[PDB]
């Protein structure tokens, strides 16, 4: 159930990170062109933080992004309730 | 219960802020290298604001970050419901 949420999310993060670097290489001046940095990107999106150090410049890139938000937000919204309950039910 | 949420959060903020400045000093050009400024960082993350003035450049830094998001979001999601109920139950 919750390990499902975590995993799905971790999949979404690794999925986006893969696809974004894929989606972004080729474009002169693309920043988002190494999985390692594509990963920090992919987290900082799903959390709806939005620091801005990184992002996609390409269309296909932002399409990736949207998915990453859409599945990554929800799936992070799962682990965020999950640990909200585990603090509640206890205390 | 709610003082638990607040506290836990305040712990998470002070935890991250400590660890990030720790995690970030050593790296030339690191911005996030004084607890005072590491604190504003640590808030602005947990809230999922993401202004971007500050952030980690190091790996270990962003690992800190992730935790700070993951525990800081949830624990801020607690105090955000908490004051959502206290407006509801009253009016």
């Amino acid at each position, epitope marked *: 159930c919750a390990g499902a949420a975590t995993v799905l999310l971790v999949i979404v993060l690794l999925a986006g990170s*893969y696809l974004a*670097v*894929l989606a*972004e*290489r*080729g*474009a*002169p*001046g*693309a*920043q988002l*062109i*190494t*999985y*390692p940095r*594509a990963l920090w990107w992919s987290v900082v999106t799903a959390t709806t933080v939005g620091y801005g150090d990184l992002y996609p410049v390409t269309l296909w890139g932002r399409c990736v992004a949207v998915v990453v938000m859409v599945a990554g937000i929800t799936s992070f919204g799962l682990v965020t309730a999950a640990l909200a309950t585990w603090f509640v039910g206890q205390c | 219960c709610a003082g638990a949420a607040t506290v836990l959060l305040v712990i998470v903020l002070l935890a991250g802020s400590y660890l990030a400045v720790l995690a970030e000093r050593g*790296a*030339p*050009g690191a911005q996030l290298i004084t607890y005072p400024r590491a604190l504003w960082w640590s808030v602005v993350t947990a809230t999922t604001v993401g202004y971007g003035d500050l952030y980690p*450049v190091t790996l270990w830094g962003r690992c800190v970050a992730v935790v700070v998001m993951v525990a800081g979001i949830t624990s801020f999601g607690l105090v955000t419901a908490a004051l959502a109920t206290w407006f509801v139950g009253q009016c």
Partner: antibody, heavy 116, light 107 residues
Framework: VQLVESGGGLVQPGGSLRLSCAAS????????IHWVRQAPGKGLEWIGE????????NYADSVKGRFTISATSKNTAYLQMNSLRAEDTAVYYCARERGDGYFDYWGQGTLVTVSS | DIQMTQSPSSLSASVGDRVTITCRASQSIGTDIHWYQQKPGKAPKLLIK??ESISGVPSRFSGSRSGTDFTLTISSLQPEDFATYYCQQSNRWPFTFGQGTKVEIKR
């Protein structure tokens, strides 16, 4: 984990040639092979990358749509070489890069010479 | 495009001496520059990543500094170190190399 590079010797200006980089090592799903060139007495020049996985191949302005990079069965990537100028006279190393952005391993590299 | 500018092209430094090799990126590139030794006729060999040492690379070999100034440094130049030394961006697409710095050994 080393890189084995076939093909390439002499071609006519405007002619063709196909270079070869066979895997021969523990080779992950998600590796780019790259193509770097060295003119005679000259620097390195990045030219092209490809992920054999989704088979998407990116190229330098230098090389624009003159060259093609081809991808998994033989665990090989290839450097199709159309519209050759005198300039492309050079050695051509392939190289693995694990998405991290530096070249861990490097094919022996061949010489492509371009003269009438 | 991103313009790695190594310094100096040539060195004639005596053995065991302190050799240093500079590489100015046109813009801030993070720590996303990687060093490479390339011996005459042979393939580039990677000495430094994120100016972080590689397994088997000798201890003479270190690479630091930021802003736009990356600095590969030979603590005690050795006879086996006559090579040309290359500089590689990662930060922006595409990847670029520096001009290159030849070291020659004095004896």
């Amino acid at each position: 984990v080393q890189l084995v590079e076939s093909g390439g010797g002499l071609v006519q200006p405007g002619g063709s040639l196909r270079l070869s980089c066979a895997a021969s090592g523990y080779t992950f799903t998600s590796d780019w092979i790259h193509w770097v060139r060295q003119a005679p007495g000259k620097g390195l020049e990045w030219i092209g990358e490809i992920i054999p996985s989704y088979g998407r191949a990116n190229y330098a302005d230098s090389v624009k749509g003159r060259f093609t990079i081809s991808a998994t069965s033989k665990n090989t990537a290839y450097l199709q070489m159309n519209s050759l100028r005198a300039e492309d006279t050079a050695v051509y190393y392939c190289a693995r890069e694990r998405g991290d952005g530096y070249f861990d391993y490097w094919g022996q590299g061949t010489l492509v010479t371009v003269s009438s | 495009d991103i313009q790695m500018t190594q310094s100096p092209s040539s060195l004639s430094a005596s053995v065991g001496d302190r050799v240093t090799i500079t590489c100015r990126a046109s813009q801030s590139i993070g720590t996303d520059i990687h060093w490479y030794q390339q011996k005459p006729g042979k393939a580039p060999k990677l000495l430094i990543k994120y100016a972080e040492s590689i397994s088997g690379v000798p201890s003479r070999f270190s690479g630091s500094r930021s802003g736009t100034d990356f600095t590969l440094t030979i603590s005690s130049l050795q006879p086996e170190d006559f090579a040309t030394y290359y500089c590689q961006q990662s930060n922006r697409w595409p990847f670029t190399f520096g001009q290159g710095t030849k070291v020659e050994i004095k004896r």
